[PDB]
Every structure is written in C-alpha cells, then in structure tokens.
Design a protein around this ligand. Sequence first.
Ligand SMILES: NC(=O)c1ccc[n+]([C@@H]2O[C@H](COP(=O)([O-])OP(=O)(O)OC[C@H]3O[C@@H](n4cnc5c(N)ncnc54)[C@H](O)[C@@H]3O)[C@@H](O)[C@H]2O)c1
Ligand SMILES: NC(=O)c1ccc[n+]([C@@H]2O[C@H](COP(=O)([O-])OP(=O)(O)OC[C@H]3O[C@@H](n4cnc5c(N)ncnc54)[C@H](O)[C@@H]3O)[C@@H](O)[C@H]2O)c1
Ligand SMILES: NC(=O)c1ccc[n+]([C@@H]2O[C@H](COP(=O)([O-])OP(=O)(O)OC[C@H]3O[C@@H](n4cnc5c(N)ncnc54)[C@H](O)[C@@H]3O)[C@@H](O)[C@H]2O)c1
Ligand SMILES: NC(=O)c1ccc[n+]([C@@H]2O[C@H](COP(=O)([O-])OP(=O)(O)OC[C@H]3O[C@@H](n4cnc5c(N)ncnc54)[C@H](O)[C@@H]3O)[C@@H](O)[C@H]2O)c1
Lengths: 259, 255, 254, 251
Amino acid sequence: MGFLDGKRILLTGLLSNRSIAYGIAKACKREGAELAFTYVGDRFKDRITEFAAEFGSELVFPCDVADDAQIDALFASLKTHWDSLDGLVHSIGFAPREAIAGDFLDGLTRENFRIAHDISAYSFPALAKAALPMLSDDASLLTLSYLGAERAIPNYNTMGLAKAALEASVRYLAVSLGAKGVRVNAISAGPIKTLAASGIKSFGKILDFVESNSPLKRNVTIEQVGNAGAFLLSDLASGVTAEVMHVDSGFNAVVGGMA
Amino acid sequence: MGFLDGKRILLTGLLSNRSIAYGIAKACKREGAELAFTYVGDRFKDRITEFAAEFGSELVFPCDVADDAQIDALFASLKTHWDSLDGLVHSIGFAPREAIAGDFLDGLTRENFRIAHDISAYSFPALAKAALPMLSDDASLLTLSYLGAERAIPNYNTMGLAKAALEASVRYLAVSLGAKGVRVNAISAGPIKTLGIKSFGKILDFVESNSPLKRNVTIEQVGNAGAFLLSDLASGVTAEVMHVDSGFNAVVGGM
Amino acid sequence: MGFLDGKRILLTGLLSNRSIAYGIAKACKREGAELAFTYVGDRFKDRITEFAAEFGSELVFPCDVADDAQIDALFASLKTHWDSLDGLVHSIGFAPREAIAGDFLDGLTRENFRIAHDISAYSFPALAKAALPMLSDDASLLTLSYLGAERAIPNYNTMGLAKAALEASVRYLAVSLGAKGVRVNAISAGPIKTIKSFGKILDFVESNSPLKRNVTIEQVGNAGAFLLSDLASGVTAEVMHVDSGFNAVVGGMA
Amino acid sequence: MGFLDGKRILLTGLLSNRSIAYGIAKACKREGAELAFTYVGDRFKDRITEFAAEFGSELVFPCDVADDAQIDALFASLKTHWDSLDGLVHSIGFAPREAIAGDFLDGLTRENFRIAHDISAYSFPALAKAALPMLSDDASLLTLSYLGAERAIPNYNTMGLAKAALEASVRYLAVSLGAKGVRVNAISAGPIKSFGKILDFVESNSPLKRNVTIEQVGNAGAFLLSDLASGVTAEVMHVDSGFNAVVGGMA
Ligand SMILES: NC(=O)c1ccc[n+]([C@@H]2O[C@H](COP(=O)([O-])OP(=O)(O)OC[C@H]3O[C@@H](n4cnc5c(N)ncnc54)[C@H](O)[C@@H]3O)[C@@H](O)[C@H]2O)c1
Ligand SMILES: NC(=O)c1ccc[n+]([C@@H]2O[C@H](COP(=O)([O-])OP(=O)(O)OC[C@H]3O[C@@H](n4cnc5c(N)ncnc54)[C@H](O)[C@@H]3O)[C@@H](O)[C@H]2O)c1
Ligand SMILES: NC(=O)c1ccc[n+]([C@@H]2O[C@H](COP(=O)([O-])OP(=O)(O)OC[C@H]3O[C@@H](n4cnc5c(N)ncnc54)[C@H](O)[C@@H]3O)[C@@H](O)[C@H]2O)c1
Ligand SMILES: NC(=O)c1ccc[n+]([C@@H]2O[C@H](COP(=O)([O-])OP(=O)(O)OC[C@H]3O[C@@H](n4cnc5c(N)ncnc54)[C@H](O)[C@@H]3O)[C@@H](O)[C@H]2O)c1
C-alpha cells in the first residue's frame, strides 16, 4: 500500500550504496515499486546484479549512454520483461577531470565540452526518446542536477554548462511528452557527504560551507533526495512537471558567507 | 502507516470543499495527521466545525489575521490542546475587487495596496512568529502563491505584488527558522476550475490548451504536493517555491 | 550631442553627493538632460535647491510619498514648467531600523511591514499613476532594487519583501504603460561603499564578485542614464544587475 | 566623442543588413569604435569586405568556429593589425534544421545535439580563450541568446538547450576573466511560417506591443561593450520589448 505500489521503474547510475540512485532505489522499493537497473561495462554486471537482488530484482541491462547501440537496445530488451515502463531515473554525469577543476578557460577544450554535454545532458532526452514506445501514459521521468547550472560555483566549470542544458531539456521534454500524460522533472540536489567525497578537499569545503550557511544548517542525505525522487516519480506528484526541485537544505535561496 | 502519521497540523483558509485547503486537509488526514482549523467571524463557526468533524477534529479557533490579538490568542488557545505544532498551512489571501481586475493602475490605491499586502503577505510570517514558541524542531510551514508573482498576468495586478513579497517571506522565514530545523515553503498552484468570471474562464481554457500536461490541476494534486512538503519525506526541502501547475510556468504558451 | 539630449527627467531621493540619485543625475546631465528634483520636508528645501543649482536646475518640489496630497500636487506643479515628462527616477526606500537588522522575525511587526512596503514599493507605481497624464509617449521610469529581493541576505529582512514587491510592480507597470510606449525598469545595484555588518558585506562582495570590486554610483549612474534613454528603447520590465556580477556567483566556498 | 571612441571591436555573424551583428556594428561605429569582422567560406569574402568598407574597415578574417585551427589563426592574424582587442561580439548560432522544427524528440540525435552545442555554445568561450592573450584588461565580450533558454518555446527545441549552456558560459566566463578586468554579458534578444506566428504573438502580447529591431539590440550591445557598462558583468539582458516578463495570450 506504498505510494508507488506496482510502479515499474528503471534506475541508471547505481554504482554503490552511496550513489544518489541507491537512495532513490531504497525509497521507491519501500513504497512498493518494482525495480530494474542499468550498468556500464560487463565488468560491473556481477556487482549491479548483487544490488538488484538487494531490491528483489533480477532485471539488469547494459547502457553506456555514449553508445547509440546500447541506448537503442535497452528498451527493446526491457520490453521482453515489462509491457510498459512507469518511471525512469537518470542519475548520470561525467566531465574530464581538468574541465571541473581550477580555471574555467584553462580546462576548456572542444572535446572536454563535447564529452560533458554528451554524457551529462544529451543522454537524458536520448533515453526518453528510446523509451517512449513503451512508456505508460502516466509515466514519470526524473533527472538530477546541481546549483552550478544556475550560478557560477568554484571548480564546477564545464559541468555547469552541461547541467544548464540538462535543466532546459527537462522543459522541452515535458512539452514533447506531456500531451500523452508523461511528466518530466529534475531534482537540483545539494552536495552529499560520503567517505570518498569528503576526502576530496575542495568538495569538503563546499560541504562545510553549506552546513554553515544553508537555512537548515545541514547537508542533505541520499535518503532525503531519495524521498523527494520517489515523490516526483509517484502519482502524488501528478500535478508537477517541467520542475527543477531543489533538495539542498535551502542553500540555493540564500547569499551565504557574509554574516 | 501514512507518511504524516502523528503529525499535528493547523490549517487556515478552509472555506469550502473546493478550497485548496480542503484538498490539503483531505490528503493530510489520509496520511494520518491530526488537524486543527481556523475561521474568520462567529458566523462561520458552525461551517468550520462541520469541516473539522469531517476530518475527525474538534479543534477550531477564530483568527482574523487583520488583528494582532487574534493571532496571539490563536496559539495561546491551541497550546492548551497540543504541546507542539508540526505543521501550518497558510491559505489566506485578499485584495479589494478593483485591485485584481482591469488595468493595474486603475485599481491601484494606497489602501488597496495596504490591505492586499497586510492580508496576503504579512499574515504568513506573522502567524509563523506567533507559532514559534510551540513549533516542533521538525515543523513545516506551507503557504500558497501564484505565477503572477513571477511574471505579469492579466488582472492579477496588485495581488502579483503581494505574492512576490509572500514568496520573499518564504526565504527569509526559512533562514530565521531553519537553524531550529523548521522548514518553510510555498506551492505556486495553477488555477482551479470551479463553477465564473469570463476572464478566469479564459485563463482556465488557456492553461488547458498550453500547459505541458494539457490539463488544469486539481485540489487533489495540490493537496498531495502540500502533504508531501508538510511531511518528513520533504526534510531536505526548504525555502522552495514548488510549482504545481501542470508545467504551465515553464513554457511560453499561445504561439 | 549626449544621448539624453533634451530629455526632461525628475529624480527623487537625492540626499547627498553619495546618493545613487546623485550619480544618476550627474550621468543624465552629462548626456544633455534637463533635471528636476523632489525633497522630503521643508527642512531639506534649501539643501535640495543647492544640489539642483549644481545641475543647472531651479526645479525643486516637495514630495513625501507617504502623503497622497503631495504626490498629486507634485505633478500639477511640474506641469507648470514642463508640458511633458520624459523620465522618472525612483530612488526611495525606508524601513524602521529594527526591521532591517538582526533576525527577520525579531524585527517583524505589522506597522514595520506596512511602512516598509508603503514607502519602498507602493510609492513607485503611485508616482507613475500620478505622472501618467503628462508622461511623454516614450517616457522611461526607473527604480532601484537590491539582490535581497531575489535571495535571502543577512539583515535585509523586511526590506527584502518590499523589494520583491517593487520588482513585481516593475512588470505590472510595464504592461500597464507599455501600449502608450512608456518603459519601466529597475536597477538591482550592489552595495555602495559610503555599520559592521555592512562592511562585512562590502568586503565579501569585493572578494567574491567576478570583477573583484564594489560598484560606484558612477557605474550605477551610467546604467541608469542608459535605461532612461532611447538607447534602451527595446528594454522594459527588466531588472538589470549593476553589481560587478555578484548576483551570478556562489561566493565564499574557496 | 562617442562612448566607444577608439575601442577596437571584432564582430562575428554579420551575414547581411538584417543580421543582429549589423545593428551592433552600426551602433558601435556611430559611437567611435574601430571594427573588424569574421566570415565563413571563401565565397563570402567579397560580401563581408563590402560591409567592412561601409564601416570604414579593411579588416576581415575567415573563421568557421567548428575548426580549432581557424579560431587560432583568427587571433594570430588579428594580432598583426591590433596589439590588443577591446571588444568581441559573438553572434553565431546553428543547429540542423530538423532539430529546430517540429517536435523536440523527432529532431533529437546525438550528432544534431553535438553540432548545436558545438557551434552555438562552445564557440563563445572557445573564442574568449583564444583571444585572451591579446584582450585589453578592460575588454568586454558579448553574446546573443534567446528566451527559449529559460522557458520552452515551440520549435526552438535543441537550440533551447544550447542557449541555456551559452548563458551558463557567460557566468563562468565572467568569473574566469573578471579578476583581469574583462566583462562578459549576453543580450537575450526578441525575435527579429511558424516564425511569423511568433512575431505576431510578440507584437500583440509584449508590454510595448511591438517587436524589437536590430537597431535596438545594437544600441544595447554598444552599451554593454562600453565603459558605461563597467559595473555590469555575468548579466543576461533582455532586449525584447518586455516579452520575457509576461504571460501573454490570456487577455
Ligand atoms: N553527488 C552529489 O553530491 C550531487 C549533487 C547534485 C547533483 N548530483 C547529480 O546526481 C547524479 C548522480 O551523482 P552521484 O551523486 O551518484 O555521483 P556521480 O556524479 O559521481 O555519479 C555519476 C554517475 O554517472 C554514471 N555514468 C558515467 N558515465 C556514464 C556512461 N557513459 N553511461 C552511463 N552512466 C554513466 C556513473 O556510473 C555514475 O553512477 C549526477 O547526475 C550528478 O551530477 C550529484
Ligand atoms: N484558487 C486558485 O486558483 C489559486 C491558485 C494559486 C494560488 N492560490 C492561493 O491559494 C490560497 C487559497 O486559495 P483558494 O483556492 O482556497 O481560494 P481563495 O483565493 O478564495 O482563498 C482566500 C482565503 O483567505 C481567507 N481569508 C481572507 N481574508 C482573511 C482574513 N482577514 N483573515 C483570515 N483569513 C482570511 C479566506 O477565508 C479564504 O479561505 C490563497 O492564498 C490563494 O491566493 C489559489
Ligand atoms: N545604497 C546602496 O548600497 C543600495 C544598493 C542597492 C539598492 N539601493 C536602493 O537604491 C535607492 C537609493 O538608495 P541610496 O543608496 O541612495 O540610499 P538610501 O537607501 O538610504 O536612500 C533612501 C532614499 O529614500 C528617500 N525617502 C525615504 N523616505 C521617504 C519618504 N517618506 N518620501 C520620499 N522619499 C523618501 C530618502 O530621502 C533617500 O533619498 C533605494 O531604493 C535603495 O534601497 C541602494
Ligand atoms: N534572429 C532572431 O530572431 C534572434 C533572436 C534572439 C537571439 N538570436 C541570436 O542572435 C545571433 C544572431 O542571429 P541573427 O538574427 O543574426 O540570425 P541567425 O540566427 O540566423 O545567425 C546565426 C549566425 O551564425 C553564423 N554561423 C553559423 N555557423 C557558423 C560557423 N560554423 N562559424 C561561424 N559563424 C557561424 C552565421 O553566419 C550567422 O550569421 C544568434 O546567436 C541567434 O541565435 C537571434
């Protein structure tokens, strides 16, 4: 009797029990959804299979979003298991290391730009288009963004451009798919404290700053992002589309650091 | 177990079973919350008592937000029933008719401006301030706004100004109350179709034709989003103005 | 010659040679405009008359925007000298001190809220309405706002609400007056170096803005002159940031 | 003297007397600037040379921004005439036609997406980076965007994504170049078949009840390129008769 009972949801981007996708998966499973997962490379098949089993699922599929052949095969494969798809979680992003460090121009190249936008922005509407023939009429598609799309954040650089494109794709997708009934939204998530992420020194300084300056004086967790994601994927949110919802302890709404 | 199980929530602005506050009330009660209600004027005591009964509550209190004493007396009274308050729904707005019809300047007077901002904007942080001594550390405060705060919409006029101030108060309230743990948000709702004004019918038709989902929102949809924001499911969400409007805010419609 | 040649512009809010209105007045005069000024209260009549003379003007008028009668009498008096008005600069703002210091709720009262919104927001469309019978078809109306309307800034508090209402009034005014041809805009100015908390903000902006410097009244003045001029004839309903880019960044996290 | 007197400004995207770049060129020249121009394709060398002479200039350079080598050669060549560059006008945009007509998903392919973002977004910071060694400390860089970056506009489709990335590049460029003193801004211009329907709608529904002209965009651009705008950076300025600020069609 959870608020996602019977909904069939495909999640990308599950790499560990610290992934945002893992938090979303937990909340969706808690609320009654049936889950399926994608992975990148045969070397990760066994590990994603273990995660799927944790969520009562045997449905895992390769999908390197850099490759048309894998996008164009993903939903043909899923269709042999599920007549229709109710939810899609796009939790994927990448840019070369030099493009998200230091000076924006020093780290700028055409290939760095191309890759960042290809993986981090194009892949969301690309997956939506490949899924369309088996989407339920009231399906819900969800992607993940970050405040660096809206305002300049140190080091975020080329990923900020790609996330702005991603957030625009939410709006154009919502129009394209909305007459059928499909909703499309993003969560603009705050930084997440994990063991490895805190080791990244510049990222830890952001965490500390958000902790000191966000309205709630605390960083968000994957359970809080996961719950917001489960809401947007559900019929509870049937009035909500083309929205970029901040789940960031309110950080986006202030000018911090001046008190 | 509903996702508001045990939460004690005060709702203002419940006038009819087509109110947005009605949809929010229904969704909160569905998810296990205990409700209390305000009303304006002794003549409406019976009607609000009936509504509270529908939601299993006997807690109704007068509160004209134009009156400082009634705002203070509201929470003094509620405190004898509830040790702490977990939610507040602000569904209150008003401007004199001429200030929300026709040309913006034609309906502009100092008193029309004053009333619209007093009732529709000041009352939200005023209620929050009076409630603060009994708010739980996890409390959630919710108000209702409209796209006319962000862009100029025909006839909305002076209410567009007041709603912009209201949405700003959401951000300043979130800062003032957030260290304690209290969250503050607004829902920017689309128009709600009931049994009217030729100008309002034109807006409803236009939203149905031009919104991404090609349909107007219902009080059930706004209510479910409200229940979410009032709940621990939304513990990461504060200072947010969430559009519940079939996506209408995100397009340039009509072309 | 200058790009405001022959334009007749009324400026409010000139209190000193540090005022934003003084910087706007200097830029407008530099570009050929004819200027007139308002003042608040009989005690300031001599001081505004001295400032007006610096700009080659003898046109000064009382206008306490709290008073309906002074707003109405202002444009009757101005019409005696000027058949039409080409520009209006609204540089007026006030909130009781407690409402713009400390905690937002600590300083919140109904009367503090009322005054802040009456003086800082209502007065702009009020002046526009009273000016309309004599506005030229290509007049330009300009007000001043601040980033605290858009995001929560420490201590700005009730003024943030009033400036949000003001920026909304820019849009509704633009629609009301636009068919005639009148344009309506705001400048969201950065803080002007001229309080311990205010110094903290100035330091933060200088350290974290893209241009690594606070703005001057000269820079706000030139942007204002631009918006008041035919160079900006395609621009209305705009809130233009003149703030060294500060609004566009998340500072302090290095 | 004009408010751009002596400023040396390079303009891209001048294809005809209807180009936004032509309106900016005319205003900049009126205000005393010295101009240089780029062009694409040897077949257009004559046409751009005529435009340069109209504005009292002999300085024209080939630059297809799809090609790293042409971007690098552009500023190497320009440096043999100008020791420093005071202004740059990026007025370049392209997507394959099917990506900006009809339904958003019908025109969406990896290669259409790549081209639209390559030409319409990457090229602005690419040019900025190649120009940097010769940019004056107080130089001003200007790009052109459109409301489709902010809200979904019919048919604009993949170009809406690319313009959103472009407007973000304005903000990251302003941070990167700002300590030096360089300013970076965009003008979100109103529109200048399904396109004529949009012009009618904007004329009927914008606050000023009229479409913008390249003269109005050009004067706003000259302002942003000048020291009058020395307090302004990282800004996207709407020059669109107020259209961005309303919900039209409902009256
Ligand atoms: N981690 C945060 O603090 C944070 C904050 C805000 C937003 N986000 C966004 O949330 C999403 C998930 O991020 P995260 O927190 O899990 O960490 P992350 O950004 O390190 O994860 C990126 C994910 O993309 C996947 N990916 C990369 N290249 C791929 C390809 N070619 N094909 C398919 N998948 C590919 C990876 O497997 C990984 O799971 C991302 O879009 C990220 O930008 C993250
Ligand atoms: N109805 C819509 O289409 C719509 C759309 C977007 C936002 N909203 C907002 O949602 C809220 C509720 O809207 P609604 O649909 O229930 O109808 P509504 O617009 O009639 O709500 C106004 C409410 O304010 C209350 N109120 C008025 N003056 C009061 C006073 N002095 N003291 C106390 N309460 C007072 C009334 O009792 C009423 O319940 C309002 O804030 C409204 O602006 C409504
Ligand atoms: N000074 C800054 O750093 C800064 C930054 C951004 C925006 N702004 C805004 O720019 C405008 C000018 O501010 P400022 O920097 O010159 O200083 P200021 O904000 O202290 O000046 C306020 C002005 O309003 C006038 N005023 C106050 N009450 C009035 C009344 N009842 N009737 C008529 N006029 C009245 C005063 O005479 C004064 O000229 C204000 O709107 C202010 O909020 C200022
Ligand atoms: N035309 C409008 O209504 C409008 C409205 C808002 C914004 N804009 C933007 O303003 C700019 C100029 O638009 P416009 O009205 O002059 O027409 P336009 O959009 O047709 O011009 C695009 C320009 O890009 C140039 N270009 C294309 N590919 C190129 C390449 N590989 N290398 C170099 N240059 C290349 C073309 O020569 C052309 O001048 C564009 O960025 C456009 O998106 C236009």
